[PDB]
């Protein structure tokens, strides 16, 4: 016999902050020997990028 106009709220995530990292700097830093050793290991961090 009666009606109620109720209001409900729904929250859904959309996305996050985009993060980009580099192997040769974050893993070791500015060492040239680290870069030389990482060059022979392949392209793992290239695939990660």
């Amino acid at each position: 016999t009666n009606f109620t106009i109720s209001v409900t709220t729904e929250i859904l995530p959309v996305s996050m902050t985009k993060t980009s990292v580099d192997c040769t700097m974050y893993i070791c830093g500015d060492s040239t020997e680290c870069s030389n050793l990482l060059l022979q290991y392949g392209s793992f961090c290239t695939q990660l990028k």
Partner: protein, 50 residues
């Protein structure tokens, strides 16, 4: 492609200047040496690594 990085120009060195000389002669070429079962322990500090 890659990352932009800068290069160092000159090297800067700063070390604690304990230049009081280290008498290694009294511990290396000493007249008397201790034994294996009772070895003498000396805490050498505040000298140079020559």
């Amino acid at each position: 492609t890659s990352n932009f990085r800068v290069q160092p120009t000159e090297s800067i060195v700063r070390f604690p200047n304990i230049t009081n000389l280290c008498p290694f002669d009294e511990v290396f070429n000493a007249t008397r040496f201790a034994s294996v079962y009772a070895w003498n322990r000396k805490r050498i500090s505040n000298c140079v690594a020559d």
